[PDB]
C-alpha cells in the first residue's frame, strides 16, 4: 500500500537536542552492561539562568549498538516528557562518540535498591506501601507507553531508576519500537529470555500484550524483594518447554493475593486473555484505596 502511518521514531535526528560536548564535565561511571556506560556528568546552559546540574550520560565503547542508542535517543524524544519516564535532556551526535544525556536519578535501579533493602524490610525503610506504588507508578509508566503505540520490550526491575521522593523512571529505551502500522512486531540481538512471552521466544512477536507479561515478571522481582526470576532454572530447552506447557512462577513471599492475580493474568498463554495497562493502573489503584 502506498498509505502508512508515519513512524517519528523512523524521522531523522532533530537537532534540537543538540549540546555542545565541551560543556560537558564527566564524572564517574554509574554503571555498565547491557548498551555502553552511564557517566554522571555536570552540563553547563540547560537551564534558563545559565546554571551547571547534574545529568547522567550514555555512550558505548569504540555496529547494532551504535544503531540502538540513536532508537532510543528517538524514541524519548518522540514520547515527550512523562514522570515515570526518564527524561532526555540533550543529546552530542556531532564532532565525536555520541552522548544521550539524560536527568540523573539518586537511587539508582531499582533492583539492586531492593536488594540493599531487603533486610530493613518492613523511616528509610522498606514497607508493603513502596512496593504497591512501585507496581502502580510502573503501571502508569507503561500505560503512557502503550497510549504512544510503543513497545518498551525489555521492562525489568534492572530498567527501573528510583529518584528523589521514591518516583519510579523507566529507562533503557535501546529495544522499544512503534508498532502503529503493524499490530505485531518481528524482530530478526541477545534478549532477556526470562522476561519474555512464549509468543516472543518462539515465534519471535512483540505487542502490547508482551509489554504486559513483562510487567508480570517486573511483580515477581518487585514482591520477592529483588530476586532472580526461575531460580536456579538455567535457559534451556527444559526451560522452554515449562513456559509452553503453562508453568509459571509461584506467588512472591510478600505479595498480596490480589497482586498475584495480576501476575499470573500477565503470564496468561493467550495474549488476547492478558490485561491492558489501563486496566492493570485501575486494579492496583483500588487496591491502594482499599486501606
Ligand atoms: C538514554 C538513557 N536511557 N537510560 C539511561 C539511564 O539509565 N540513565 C540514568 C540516570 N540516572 C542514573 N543514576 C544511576 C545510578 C545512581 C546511583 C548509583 C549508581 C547508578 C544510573 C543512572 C542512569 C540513559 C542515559
Redesign the pocket.
Given at each position: 500500500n502506498n498509505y502508512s502511518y508515519i513512524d517519528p521514531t523512523q524521522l531523522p535526528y532533530d537537532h534540537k537536542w543538540e549540546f555542545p560536548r565541551n560543556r560537558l564535565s564527566f564524572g564517574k561511571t554509574?554503571?555498565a552492561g547491557a548498551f555502553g556506560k552511564?557517566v554522571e556528568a555536570t552540563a553547563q546552559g540547560l537551564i534558563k539562568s545559565d546554571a551547571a546540574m547534574t545529568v547522567?550520560?550514555?555512550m558505548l565503547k569504540p555496529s547494532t549498538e551504535r544503531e540502538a542508542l540513536m532508537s532510543?535517543?528517538k524514541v524519548?524524544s518522540y514520547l515527550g516528557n512523562h514522570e515515570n519516564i526518564?527524561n532526555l535532556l540533550g543529546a552530542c551526535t556531532h564532532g565525536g562518540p555520541t552522548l544521550?544525556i539524560?536527568?540523573?536519578?539518586?537511587?539508582?535501579?531499582l533492583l539492586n535498591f531492593l536488594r540493599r533493602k531487603r533486610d530493613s524490610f518492613h523511616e528509610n525503610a522498606l514497607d508493603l506501601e513502596d512496593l504497591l506504588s512501585f507496581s502502580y507508578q510502573v503501571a502508569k509508566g507503561m500505560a503512557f507507553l502503550a497510549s504512544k503505540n510503543c513497545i518498551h520490550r525489555d521492562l525489568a526491575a534492572r530498567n527501573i531508576?528510583l529518584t528523589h521522593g521514591r518516583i519510579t523512571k523507566i529507562?533503557?529505551?535501546g529495544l522499544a519500537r512503534v508498532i502503529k502500522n503493524d499490530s505485531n512486531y518481528v524482530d530478526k540481538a541477545r534478549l532477556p529470555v526470562k522476561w519474555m512471552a512464549p509468543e516472543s521466544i518462539f515465534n519471535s512477536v512483540y505487542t502490547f500484550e508482551s509489554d504486559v507479561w513483562s510487567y508480570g515478571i517486573f511483580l515477581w522481582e518487585l514482591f520477592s524483594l529483588g530476586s532472580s526470576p526461575y531460580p536456579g532454572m538455567p535457559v534451556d530447552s527444559k526451560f522452554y518447554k515449562m513456559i509452553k506447557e503453562g508453568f509459571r512462577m509461584s506467588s512472591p513471599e510478600h505479595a498480596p493475593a490480589e497482586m498475584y492475580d495480576i501476575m499470573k493474568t500477565c503470564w496468561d498463554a493467550d495474549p488476547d486473555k492478558r490485561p491492558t495497562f489501563k486496566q492493570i493502573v485501575q486494579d492496583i489503584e483500588k487496591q491502594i484505596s482499599e486501606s
Open positions: 554509574l554503571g552511564v547522567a550520560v550514555k532510543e535517543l524519548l526518564v544521550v539524560t536527568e540523573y536519578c539518586c537511587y539508582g535501579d531508576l529507562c533503557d529505551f
